[PDB]
A paper describes a structure:
Penicillin-binding proteins (PBPs) are membrane-bound enzymes involved in the final stages of bacterial cell wall synthesis on the periplasmic side of the membrane. PBP3 shares 42% sequence identity with the corresponding protein in E. coli and has been identified as the primary target of a number of β-lactams used to treat pseudomonal infections, including the cephalosporin analogues cefsulodin and ceftazidime, piperacillin, and the parenteral carbapenem, doripenem. PBP3 is a two-domain protein comprising a C-terminal transpeptidase linked to an extended N-terminal domain. The active site of PBP3 is located in a long cleft running parallel with the β3 strand across the lower part of the transpeptidase domain.
Three isomorphous structures of P. aeruginosa PBP3 have been determined: apo-PBP3 at 2.0 Å resolution, PBP3/carbenicillin complex at 2.4 Å resolution, and PBP3/ceftazidime complex at 2.6 Å resolution. The SXXK motif (S294-T295-V296-K297) is located at the N-terminal end of α2 and includes the nucleophilic S294, together with the α8–β2f loop (residues 407–409) that forms the base of the cleft. The SXN motif (S349-S350-N351) occurs in the α4–α5 turn, and residues 328–334 (β2c and β2c–β2d loop) form one side of the elongated cleft; the third motif KS/TG (K484-S485-G486) is positioned on strand β3 and, together with residues 530–533 in the β5–α11 loop, forms the opposite side of the cleft. Unlike in PBP2a,12 which is relatively resistant to β-lactam inhibition, the catalytic S294 is positioned favorably for acylation in an open substrate-binding pocket. The three conserved structural motifs interact with each other via a network of hydrogen bonds: the hydroxyl group of S294 forms hydrogen bonds with the side chains of both K297 and K484 (2.7 Å and 2.8 Å), which are hydrogen bonded to S349 and N351, respectively. The position of K297 makes it one of the possible proton receptors from the catalytic S294 during the acylation reaction, in addition to the possible contribution of the β-lactam carboxylate. There are eight water molecules in the active site cleft of apo-PBP3, which form an extensive hydrogen-bonding network with the protein. The two loops connecting β3 and β4 (K490-A500) and β5 and α11 (S526-F531) are disordered in the apo-enzyme.
Author numbering: 50 to 490, 500 to 525, 531 to 558
Amino acid sequence: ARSVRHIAIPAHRGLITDRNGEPLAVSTPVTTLWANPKELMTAKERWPQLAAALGQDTKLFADRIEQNAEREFIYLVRGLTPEQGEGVIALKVPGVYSIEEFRRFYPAGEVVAHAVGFTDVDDRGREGIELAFDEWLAGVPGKRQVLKDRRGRVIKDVQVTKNAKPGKTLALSIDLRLQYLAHRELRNALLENGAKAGSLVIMDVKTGEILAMTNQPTYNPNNRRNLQPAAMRNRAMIDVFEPGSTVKPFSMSAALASGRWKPSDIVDVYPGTLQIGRYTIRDVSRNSRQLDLTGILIKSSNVGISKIAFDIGAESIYSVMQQVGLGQDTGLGFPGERVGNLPNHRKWPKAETATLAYGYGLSVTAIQLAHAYAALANDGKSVPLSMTRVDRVPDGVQVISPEVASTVQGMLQQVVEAQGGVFRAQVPGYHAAGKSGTARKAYRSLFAGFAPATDPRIAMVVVIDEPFGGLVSAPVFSKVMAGALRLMNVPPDNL
Ligand SMILES: [Cl-]
Ligand SMILES: [Cl-]
Ligand SMILES: [Cl-]
């Protein structure tokens, strides 16, 4: 009696590197021992020795084999070293066989854990890039057709072995050097402030490339035995929050594009509150009367952006926020990535208009906020997001007019640089631009910005759990932007 089995030959999984060729996921040959239980069952006297070699409990091992006595294949140990494998084969236990497999290892470990993600016990991607690019990376298994007896041993092949085709190499957009910098500074900020979680995204505003994307807590993908759910969250891509004051720049972009506001136009925000029906809008800083558009950003005046929003209508604000991708499906095709929500109310009442304009009327991810700021930095042109290295840059879409984008860039440079501004976000050597806010989901300190002002190269978002924006997250923007700019050999623009 017979059977014909088709056997899959494992294909070498494609190498993942960072944009510079540094190894992030490597399929490395391992020896895994498997057994044909029908054969093993004829050599029970060998089991205890086999089990000792496997460092396995004799009872559990024996039970597992008896449990599987009618199967022709089970694994004994996977991902051993060649040496260790041969140690066991030398035992010459009937029904024990060795095969070359490929096991994934992650050389950068926790540093790029969430972005790279990892594979299953079957070498199929299950988080991050490994998941998103599985087909590119996996290649195609080879096939043997094997004639087997009822033991069931291989009698012969019944056709030519069809060799596996290796997966393809993949270079990420991530620059491991920037990734590491962001990773460490985020972590220090958390430790200092007694906060539990945070994210940090760095984008190339010219190419759409995600140069860094780090979250805390994080985890070691090479050892996932004591994992906790909170550590596995790729927060940059899956935590959503109301961005608050960080989207005022997009509200201002609508104001400018409306034809009705110039940067130097004034709004009276005294006495720092504004009664809307039953509701009261309140500024945190309430020592202002007249503020120009830049002053509204500096003071984070909710009252101010609200009065502007009442003037230009929420539709225009919605349109800018949508075009820059806030709450939109600019997804890179990572299963599970969040889109957030930018409700198209179509007609907004005062309350909703105001709440949208000062950023508590939408939810976004850190990645969208970074991409939005990248378009702004890129003279209003949005280059499509990428987590893989971009050699041929796609044409951008003009989502904010170049003139409005340049104008808002200048205002944001002032919130960082001007008196009463977010001085802690200043980056020595460069003109930096950006905006603080308090995100809500539970509050988080936010800072979002880009640099250098004169020919922006990167956009960055810092999100930190708050047990304020300009106090907690701003100094992190400063330090990380200071490092990243220099890592990219960006010439200092403060001359
Ligand atoms: Cl593991
Ligand atoms: Cl959630
Ligand atoms: Cl490309």
